[PDB]
């Protein structure tokens, strides 16, 4: 695995020990061979788990999720996928790692796709080795991979709204269920219905995941209601997964706006990862997977792969060359390598709109490429009437940095800025000049 120009897909089934058994073997070998190594975790939660698996080995944890005093002599760095890509984009020196290990390498957030593209291009160049650890590489067509113990798979209608009857199997169960929903809002309704029926529910989503995931360890619970983020190595002591088999797909319409389409079917890889939360204990056969729809290749045309190209166009590789997407995921987008390359000052704007602004990649790009500076929020208010953002059926309003109350009507509409209450609160703060 460790030789230059190799990319290995470590595709052992979910729970086979890739993270806790195989990764520390790889790391010890890498250290013996004096390979400057990076290890990429999808989340802070996974980063902390890796610390436990790697404990005693000389690894520099480039994350505040781990409280360790470094020796200063580590040649192995560990950070999150997003942090890697972020550091590549910034005017900070990222070492040219000889060995690049991505855990949970199926993650489809734009920064993860971009990190795979950059890594795989370095490997293709003859410069580096890589290991992508995942049970479900791109284009997998098997939603029902092997597991540590047998799983009971049942196709069944799964509620996506509050229910009063007709789903007794949901609440009749006496164990612990992980339930995958397509969005925060849909999870909120299911969670409220379950709470009313006397169940203890924890909700997980990207913005809440570190904090809330701890509750699964510190409190007793009957259901975890989660979005797709729990496909990225989140482990639960559960005996059932309920899977709506649905997700939202960000779609760029006419090059001009982003909508959140669907819900629509998950990919096979997603379904396999959802299912793969259970069946993990070889002493507990008969964990249940209840699934409420089929799979489809909903990553085709999905905005994250175009956003990944926007990131990769703005990462230096060598002269004017630009990193390609990892080959098996490179047709998910119709894009021209280099089309989104920005000049130095617009690039800096683009970066800051993502990092400090917390704006979606696509929307950051629209603003930066328009020649707008990071603090100029006039665009949040000068869009067409149909870009009016609504809050409880009334136009959303903020006080501008000038002190004027205005309706939020962004020049470019990206549905991710108001996908839930939290998102809209954050965007309102942005529009107001508060970050």
Curated annotation (Swiss-Prot):
Site for Involved in NS3 ATPase and RTPase activities, residues: 274, 277
Residues in compartment: Lumenal: 1-435
Membrane topology: Peripheral membrane protein
Domain Helicase C-terminal as annotated: residue spans: 150-329
Record localization: Host cytoplasm; Host endoplasmic reticulum membrane
Domain Helicase ATP-binding: 1-155
Region (Important for RNA-binding) location: 3-6
PTM section of the record: Acetylated by host KAT5. Acetylation modulates NS3 RNA-binding and unwinding activities and plays an important positive role for viral replication.
Binding-site residues, ATP: 12-19
Residues with the N6-acetyllysine modification: 207
Function: Displays three enzymatic activities: serine protease, NTPase and RNA helicase. NS3 serine protease, in association with NS2B, performs its autocleavage and cleaves the polyprotein at dibasic sites in the cytoplasm: C-prM, NS2A-NS2B, NS2B-NS3, NS3-NS4A, NS4A-2K and NS4B-NS5. NS3 RNA helicase binds RNA and unwinds dsRNA in the 3' to 5' direction. Leads to translation arrest when expressed ex vivo. Disrupts host centrosome organization in a CEP63-dependent manner to degrade host TBK1 and inhibits innate immune response. Inhibits the integrated stress response (ISR) in the infected cell.
Subunit structure, as described in the record: Forms a heterodimer with NS2B. Interacts with NS4B. Interacts with unphosphorylated RNA-directed RNA polymerase NS5; this interaction stimulates RNA-directed RNA polymerase NS5 guanylyltransferase activity. Interacts with non-structural protein 2A. Interacts with host SHFL; this interaction promotes NS3 degradation via a lysosome-dependent pathway. Interacts with host CEP63; this interaction disorganizes the centrosome and inhibits host innate immune response.
Protein name stated in the entry: Serine protease NS3
Species name: Zika virus
Residues included from the entire protein: 1681 to 2115 of 3419
């Amino acid at each position: 695995m460790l030789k230059k120009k190799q990319l290995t897909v470590l595709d052992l089934h979910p729970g086979a020990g890739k993270t806790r058994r195989v990764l520390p073997e790889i790391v010890r070998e890498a250290i013996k061979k004096r390979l400057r190594t990076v290890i990429l975790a999808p989340t802070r939660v996974v980063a902390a788990e890796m610390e436990e698996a790697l404990r005693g080995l000389p690894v520099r944890y480039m994350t505040t999720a781990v409280n360790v005093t470094h020796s200063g002599t580590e040649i192995v760095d560990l950070m999150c996928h997003a942090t890697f890509t972020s550091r590549l984009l910034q005017p900070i020196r990222v070492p040219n790692y000889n060995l690049n290990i991505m855990d949970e390498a199926h993650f489809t957030d734009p920064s993860s796709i971009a990190a795979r593209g950059y890594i795989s291009t370095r490997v293709e160049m003859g410069e580096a080795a890589a290991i992508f650890m995942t049970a479900t590489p791109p284009g997998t067509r098997d939603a029902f991979p092997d597991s540590n113990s047998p799983i009971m798979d049942t196709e069944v209608e799964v509620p996506e709204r509050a229910w009063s009857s007709g789903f007794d199997w949901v609440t009749d169960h006496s164990g612990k269920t992980v339930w995958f929903v397509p969005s925060v809002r849909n999870g909120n309704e299911i969670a409220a219905c379950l709470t009313k029926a006397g169940k203890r529910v924890i909700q997980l989503s990207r913005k809440t995941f570190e904090t809330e995931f701890q509750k699964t360890k510190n409190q007793e619970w009957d259901f975890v209601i989660t979005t797709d983020i729990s496909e990225m190595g989140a482990n639960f002591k559960a005996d059932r997964v309920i899977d709506s088999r649905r997700c939202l797909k960000p779609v760029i319409l006419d090059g001009e706006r982003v909508i959140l389409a669907g819900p629509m079917p998950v990919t096979h890889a997603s379904a396999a990862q959802r299912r793969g939360r259970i069946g993990r204990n070889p002493n507990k056969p008969g964990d249940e997977y209840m699934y409420g729809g089929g799979c489809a290749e909903t990553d085709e045309g999905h905005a994250h792969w175009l956003e990944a190209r926007m990131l990769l166009d703005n990462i230096y590789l060598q002269d004017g060359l630009i990193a390609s997407l990892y080959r098996p995921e490179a047709d998910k987008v119709a894009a021209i390598e280099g089309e989104f390359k920005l000049r130095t000052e617009q690039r800096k704007t683009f970066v800051e709109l993502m990092k400090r602004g917390d704006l979606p990649v696509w929307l950051a790009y629209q603003v930066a490429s328009a020649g707008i500076t990071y603090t100029d929020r006039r665009w949040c208010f000068d869009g067409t009437t149909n870009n009016t953002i609504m809050e409880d059926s009334v136009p959303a309003e903020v006080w501008t940095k000038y002190g004027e109350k205005r309706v939020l009507k962004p020049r470019w509409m990206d549905a991710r800025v108001c996908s839930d209450h939290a998102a809209l609160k954050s965007f309102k703060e942005f529009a107001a000049g508060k970050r």
